[PDB]
């Protein structure tokens, strides 16, 4: 099959700036049959560009396409807030159509340190035999952050899961929630529960903790 | 205006088959090609195959050849996708898409019109409503709800029946090793409000017809 590789994977720009997204094919795309799509969270993809440089109905002039052979580009001449989304290329020059892996275009802003909160498991949950401990990292930028769970100073690894919100449309920050899961039996055997957070906006890691019972 | 409307979410056990429909309206049907494209959570778009209803000609992606059948009903302007031998790897949103129209009625080939998508979840897990636990607050305080052990996706969360929107963050669910999902929803509020204001998270899990209103106290 023809493999499409997009670049960059994820990058950040500000409204007003010019964005250039790239799509490289493993073989030449026949007739320049290369399309670009925009996709926002929860939506179906939206056709922007077809046949390398053709623009779909309803698509603003700030979007343009170029390229030939194996190298193609989507240019957004002057970014608007509505333009921050995921973008996909697609080749349809052969019967076996393929898509690139996607490029996420996010909004650049100044560094913002997370506000950190820790939550003990509820008494209600403890009745069921399982304890969930939750750590919240609120309104930070950039997206990269590290959470380290500690139970009586023992580093926990492999027993937590985390997820991150979409970039906030107003302040362009992210938030992160991490849940540490332990049995009630293990939870009741230990005292100090801590979430240690590392982030570019923090000169040194921040730890929030609680003592079980207190 | 061309509109593609797909059938509702599906839940399947492994080994089983799934049939998804896509009804087209507002334009010519048989002449243009309809395609199916899927997207696993957080992953890329993947083309499955297409059909031109007029001549019933089909074209399938090599990786899915033998597992996928696409058909069309001209009398109802509906196209169908059937996928067999389902495994958890097939959990994805499935989209139907139609080629565009050009000057003098010539087909575009690029996918101009799209359905809303259909979630197909494949798992051994059984439908289960969530347990909702408080994330209790300790100038700004955070509180929330932990929506644990539900299946399948999705769940929605509001606060104070829609009266509280500022500072709300509802996180993407995680899939636990148990095969059940869990998500959290939080809100930041003035610490001074903790003694006076009531906070309730409203959780709706449509797949199990479960609704929960959970008061969160300090």
Residue numbers in the entry:
A (entry chain L): 1 to 27, 27A, 28 to 213
B (entry chain H): 1 to 52, 52A, 53 to 82, 82A, 82B, 82C, 83 to 100, 100A, ...
Task: Copy the relevant paper text.
MPER bnAbs show outstanding breadth, neutralizing up to >98% primary isolates, but have uncommon features. Notably, long heavy complementarity-determining region (CDR) H3 loops with aromatic residues at the tip facilitate bnAb binding to the hydrophobic MPER and nearby membrane. DNA sequencing revealed PGZL1 was from subclass IgG1, whereas most MPER bnAbs are IgG3s. Using X-ray crystallography and cryo-EM, we determined the orientation, angle of approach, and composition of the PGZL1-Env interaction.
PGZL1.H4K3 (hereafter H4K3) was chosen for more detailed characterization. Notably, H4K3 neutralized 100% viruses at ≤ 50 μg/ml (n = 130), with an IC50 of 1.43 μg/ml. Crystal structures of H4K3 unliganded and with MPER671-683 bound were determined at 1.45 Å and 1.98 Å resolution, respectively. As this anion-binding site is absent in peptide-free H4K3, despite the crystallization buffer containing SO4, this site may be induced by MPER binding. Similar to all MPER bnAbs, CDRH3 aromatics were crucial for HIV neutralization, but the observed pre-configuration of H4K3 to bind the MPER and lipid heads on the membrane may explain its faster on-rate compared with PGZL1, where reorientation of the CDRH3 is needed.
